């Protein structure tokens, strides 16, 4: 499984969520930003580690981070 973390610099722009090709991330209620939204990664067992979320994140530095970890059949994107 790959380690996906969300950091408090998130501005709830939802760009990472609409960039993930696997439905791993989602938006939760929060109070830390004006959008009152925060990303969250409850399904990192299906994460392949493509880093589209990191490409989509606008903040400097990143508020979503993907640490490539141990490989499984779902994280390697295998259909066989």
């Amino acid at each position: 499984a790959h380690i996906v973390k969300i950091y408090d610099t998130c501005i709830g722009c939802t760009q990472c969520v609409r960039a993930c090709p696997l439905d791993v991330l989602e938006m939760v209620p929060w109070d830390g930003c004006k959008a009152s939204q925060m990303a969250s990664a409850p399904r990192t067992e299906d994460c392949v580690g493509c880093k589209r979320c990191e490409t989509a994140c606008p903040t400097d530095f990143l508020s979503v981070r993907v640490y490539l970890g141990s490989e499984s059949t779902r994280s390697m994107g295998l259909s066989y």
Binding site: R52, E54, T55, R65, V66, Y67, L68
Partner: peptide, 18 residues
């Protein structure tokens, strides 16, 4: 990549972003 120490010594890349 400011957090290169968090991935270790030998990682492939950090993707096509940036």
């Amino acid at each position: 990549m400011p957090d290169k120490k968090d991935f270790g010594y030998s990682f492939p890349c950090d993707g096509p972003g940036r």
